[PDB]
Design a protein around this ligand. Structure first.
Ligand SMILES: CCCCNS(=O)(=O)c1ccccc1
Ligand code: NA
Length: 116
């Protein structure tokens, strides 16, 4: 659902976050297919990108309002519902916190969790 202009807003942060964490595009594609394991190279990537867009703070607490605001009108009710179930985050560290949220959201609504 991401609009095509988001993709250059994000390009520099994407390149940075992939390089910092050893993330591959293949791993990003996998998350988008609904497959996600608790591997730091992908989970720290997701944390990295959320932070980049100011959607999480230094302990992976989620700014849900800022998050919903980046979603299409048609997705927001469902997204707000799932965030109701899946927040607040919890986990062993910032990456694991986002792993657990990604899993939660994917289990429960699997049109909401896209990873750029
Ligand atoms: C739902 C977020 C999961 C990780 N997504 S994202 O950060 O790549 C992103 C997606 C859409 C808008 C902004 C950031
Ligand atoms: Na890894």
């Amino acid at each position: 659902w991401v609009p095509p202009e988001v993709f250059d807003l994000v390009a520099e942060d994407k390149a940075r976050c992939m390089s910092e964490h050893g993330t591959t595009q293949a791993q990003i594609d996998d998350v988008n297919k609904g497959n996600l394991v608790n591997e730091p190279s992908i989970t720290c990537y997701m944390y990295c990108l959320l932070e980049a867009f100011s959607l999480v703070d230094d302990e992976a607490n989620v700014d849900e309002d800022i998050m919903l605001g980046l979603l299409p009108d048609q997705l927001q009710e469902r997204a707000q519902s799932v965030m109701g179930k899946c927040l607040p985050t919890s986990g062993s560290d910032n990456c694991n916190k986002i792993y657990n949220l990604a899993k939660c959201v994917q289990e429960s609504a699997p049109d909401v969790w896209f990873v750029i």
